């Protein structure tokens, strides 16, 4: 590390005249004499947008000791996992919440495995996805608490894929909106006022405002009759999509 | 044989109605019991009370007023008050549940169970009259029940009666001092409602009257009673031409033909002079010229607006006392020669003047002193767009995050009625800026 020599840094324009003791504010009470400006406490800003200090993941502690059947294959240009045993014989109840929990991870290859495995499990599953909804709530809200843009975007993509994955799931999800939505209230309006010029972010869906609006309209499309009333109770500024 | 019917709705409406109906009773010499005294007559002429009262056939008189509210506190207070024998026992309509500053509640939920009885009472009262001039209506605009019931009443009356004149005396929220926190919403909604339903509207915000009381009357702790008394005096000065002989009388229908250039622009602001206490009222001339100058300095506007920021469309103003047309004309010429006051291009002459002989009365225990000459002025000027701008800003600040919207949408009102009022107010401001440009 470096630092200037501190006793040498100096000011030039200021004059070197020194008042000494001789001063005295007594006997010269002009009405224009200065007073203090007393110290003022700064405006409290709290930590609403501060980072979450991501908690410890379950995926790492399962994989390091190796009890999940997953195979990293490097034949493809990008790694594509192949299954030691097939997902349909795999029990979703024990495994799937772990894969959901693994999303919080950032260090390779744990993050890679977690998200890609969630995609393949959701795509493969047909009906067994339905009963496992109640316990999936903990990983998803824990991840959404991270207040990190990358993890949040990945998790919203997860939610889209989960809802579109199989029928009957949206209305089953209706009671659980209360605890999963309110993070969306933070980031509904976080979109860039780039103005006239071109936006290049359509390639990499980092526009979290567009992602959040897309997810919300998908939830309302798939949910059912009470989906709108739940959304409006949860987030105020929502506007209906199914209602003309 | 000319009659006018008064409607009071909301707590502010009832409290201003008490103040005004004291004033008219004192002006006509009627005791609180409603009986004119057999001895000690003070008022010459006949049929003069007929504009506001109806003879019972033998003795006492019935005011041509109706009182409406959903919270029975103020109405019960009136019925136990000293004026209980004055009004009809069954024209003081009291509900059971208050709107609680919720415009949706008073427009869709609980007012509809009272409006039927209200309009029945209005029909019963209007059947008696023969030369019905119109209706006066009083309602604070920043209150749920007042705004909602007033809007519904105006909407029903517009289709029940057609072309009858209706005058709304609204008390808009002050730019910075206000009692509630939600009142911009209901003020905008009610303004949208009455803009297409009321012939004439008067601005009477509180802060300006507070400042007038502080400067002129030397009042350091004013309360609501003083404001109500001042508004009552303004009403009396406005309507004295219908019941007192005058050199150049002005009818209520002499307004929709003099003041409003276009159907959309019918909000006007008032001023009154002189306002002075007896301890220093008699030391000066009270000359007609200086009182009409007092009517026009921006300091004595009854609404918190600056006339110097805009042009004038019209000024209709009435003297009561011993004024003369020569002095009125001499003062008007001076006002025109004055440079700080400018009129719109397409209005060469913009003054309508009324003269009435009856000097204003004084209420014992009040604040004002007794003088001969008084002037009450009503102005329509371009400067009033600023209050709409400020309330619009206050409105969209909260409507950006959709605050308080559930407390309205949960009671029958859809989501989209706020935006209609918003765009209507934007259209109003565009209309003002359109009219204000020179040709």
């Amino acid at each position: 590390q470096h630092a200037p020599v501190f006793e040498d840094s100096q000011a030039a324009t200021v004059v070197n005249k020194f008042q000494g003791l001789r001063q005295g504010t007594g006997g010269k009470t002009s009405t224009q004499l200065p007073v203090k400006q007393p110290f003022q406490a700064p405006n409290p800003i709290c930590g609403a947008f501060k980072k979450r200090t991501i908690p410890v993941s379950e995926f790492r502690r399962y994989y390091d000791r190796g009890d999940l059947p997953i195979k990293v294959d490097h034949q493809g240009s990008v790694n594509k996992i192949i299954w030691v045993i097939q997902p349909d014989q795999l029990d979703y109840h024990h495994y799937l919440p772990i894969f959901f929990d693994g999303l919080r991870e950032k260090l390779d290859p744990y993050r890679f495995l977690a998200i890609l495995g969630t995609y393949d499990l959701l795509e493969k599953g047909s009906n067994k996805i339905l009963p496992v909804i109640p316990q999936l709530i903990i990983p998803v809200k824990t991840a959404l608490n991270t207040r990190d843009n990358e993890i949040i975007g990945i998790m919203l993509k997860i939610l889209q894929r989960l809802v579109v994955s199989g029928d009957m799931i949206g209305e089953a999800l209706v009671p659980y909106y209360r605890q999963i939505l309110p993070i969306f209230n933070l980031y509904k309006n976080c979109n860039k006022n780039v103005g006239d010029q071109i936006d290049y972010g359509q390639r990499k869906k980092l526009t979290l405002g567009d992602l959040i609006q897309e997810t919300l309209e998908l939830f309302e499309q798939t949910g059912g009759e009470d989906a709108f009333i739940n959304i409006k109770y949860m987030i105020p500024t929502y506007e209906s999509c199914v209602h003309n | 044989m000319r009659e006018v019917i008064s409607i009071h709705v909301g707590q502010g409406g009832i409290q201003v109605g008490n103040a005004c109906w004291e004033l008219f009773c004192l002006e006509h010499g009627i005791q609180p019991d409603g009986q004119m005294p057999s001895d000690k007559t003070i008022g010459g002429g006949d049929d003069a009370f007929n504009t506001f009262f109806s003879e019972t056939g033998a003795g006492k008189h019935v005011p041509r007023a109706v009182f409406l509210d959903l919270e029975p506190t103020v109405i019960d207070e009136v019925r136990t008050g000293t004026y209980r024998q004055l009004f009809h026992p069954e024209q003081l309509i009291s509900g059971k549940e208050d709107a609680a500053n919720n415009f949706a509640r008073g427009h869709y939920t609980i007012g509809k169970e009272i409006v039927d009885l209200c309009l029945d009472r209005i029909r019963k009262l209007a059947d008696n009259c023969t030369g019905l001039q119109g209706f006066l209506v009083f309602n604070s605009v920043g209150g749920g029940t007042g705004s909602g019931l007033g809007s519904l009443l105006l909407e029903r009356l517009s289709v029940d009666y057609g072309k009858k004149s209706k005058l709304g005396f609204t008390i808009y929220p002050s730019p910075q001092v206000s009692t509630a926190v939600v009142e911009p919403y209901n003020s905008i909604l009610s303004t949208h409602s009455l803009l297409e339903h009321t012939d004439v509207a008067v601005m009477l915000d509180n802060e300006a009257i507070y400042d007038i009381c502080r400067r002129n009357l030397d009042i350091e702790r004013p309360t609501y009673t003083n404001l109500n008394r001042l508004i009552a005096q303004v009403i009396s000065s406005l309507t004295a031409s219908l019941r007192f002989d005058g050199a150049l009388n002005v009818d209520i229908t002499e307004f929709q033909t003099n003041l409003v250039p276009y159907p959309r622009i019918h909000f006007m602001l008032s001023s009154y002079a002189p306002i002075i206490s007896a301890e220093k009222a008699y030391h000066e001339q009270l000359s007609v010229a200086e009182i009409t100058n007092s009517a026009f300095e921006p300091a004595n506007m009854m609404a918190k607006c600056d006339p110097r920021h805009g042009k004038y469309m019209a000024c209709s103003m009435m003297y009561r006392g011993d004024v003369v047309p020569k002095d009125v004309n001499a003062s008007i010429a001076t006002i025109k020669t004055k440079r700080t006051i400018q009129f719109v291009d397409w209005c060469p002459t913009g003054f309508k003047v009324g003269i009435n002989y009856q000097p204003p009365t004084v209420v014992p225990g009040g604040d004002l002193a007794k003088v001969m000459r008084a002037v009450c002025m009503i102005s329509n000027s371009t400067a009033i767009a600023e209050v709409f701008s400020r309330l619009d800003h206050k409105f969209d600040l909260m409507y950006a995050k959709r605050a308080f919207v559930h407390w309205y949408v949960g009671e029958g009102m859809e989501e989209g009625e706020f935006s209609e009022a918003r765009e209507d107010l934007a259209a109003l401001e565009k209309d003002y800026e359109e009219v204000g440009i020179e040709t």
Partner: protein
Amino acid sequence: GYIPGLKPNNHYGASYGEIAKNCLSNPKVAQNPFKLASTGFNYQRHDFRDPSLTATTHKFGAQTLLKNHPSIDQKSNQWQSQTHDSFRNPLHKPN
């Protein structure tokens, strides 16, 4: 300078001269019930007493307030402000 009545008990909406006249013509503002002299030689004529038994053995102990607050006079503002004619004549002044 200092018209006595105004500041302690906030006087309600009325003319400044009216309030001054009222709070000047009202009683008190003078006369000694205790008969203490302004010099201070008479200080021990009157013992300084404040006319309940505080007891913390079981409950309470807060004690009520001093006798400088209103009773029976609780009465409505519209009533007090709104009377018809039974007042002083505003402009009588017999000549």
